[PDB]
């Protein structure tokens, strides 16, 4: 099911902004786990694939693929869109950008 509940999308976006990249195995059946402020959260890989497909078509992420695994990276406009979506501070920066 590609019906993405809104909290799952918010968690995926928050992890995407914090850790500038997201890696997900390309399997229709499977679960993707990420860490947000400790603990974990799990969203089906099909929903992550759907969200990243939407983001890629909107020219907000760069995509790479190798050995059944995706690698999505937020670019500058994708970073700005993430900052506007989660209403983070203008000083909010991904880990790969923080010195």
């Amino acid at each position: 099911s590609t019906y993405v509940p809104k909290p799952s999308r918010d968690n995926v976006y928050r992890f995407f902004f914090t850790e500038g990249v997201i890696a997900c195995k390309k399997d229709r059946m499977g679960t993707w786990t990420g860490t947000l402020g400790g603990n974990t959260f799990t969203v089906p890989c099909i929903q992550v694939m759907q969200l990243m497909r939407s983001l890629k078509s909107r020219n907000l992420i760069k995509e790479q693929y190798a050995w059944r695994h995706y690698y999505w990276t937020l670019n500058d406009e994708g970073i700005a869109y993430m900052r506007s979506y989660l209403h983070l501070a203008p000083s909010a920066m991904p880990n790969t950008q923080k010195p």
């Binding site: 809104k6 909290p7 918010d10 209403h87």
Partner: protein, 100 residues
């Protein structure tokens, strides 16, 4: 009709805003809601009566709004082409669970 325009916008973050009759009533009956905002021109007496009564039973607050269209525009139920006057989805009730 001024400060609620900031309260609802702040509560939009972290999904604290709840909109629609059914969802607002579902909050009011099963608690977990801090307050609800009702616009008087709801066109249904039963609408406003039940919305007020559900808060009254749970002792929840209630703020009246003079314009349904303005409240709907506040919570973001508007279709853009920045054509915010193109179409505004009617929103007679707004309930807040998380203030921000």
């Amino acid at each position: 009709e001024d400060a609620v325009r900031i309260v609802i916008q702040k509560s939009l973050e972290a999904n604290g805003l709840v909109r629609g009759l059914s969802e607002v009533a579902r909050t009011l009956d099963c608690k977990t809601a801090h307050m609800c905002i009702l616009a008087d021109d709801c066109e249904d007496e039963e609408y406003k009566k039940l919305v007020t009564a559900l808060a009254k039973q749970g002792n929840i607050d209630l703020i009246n709004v003079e314009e349904r269209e303005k409240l709907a525009q506040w919570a973001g139920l508007v279709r853009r082409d920045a054509g915010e006057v193109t179409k505004t989805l009617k929103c007679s009730s707004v309930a807040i669970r998380d203030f921000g």
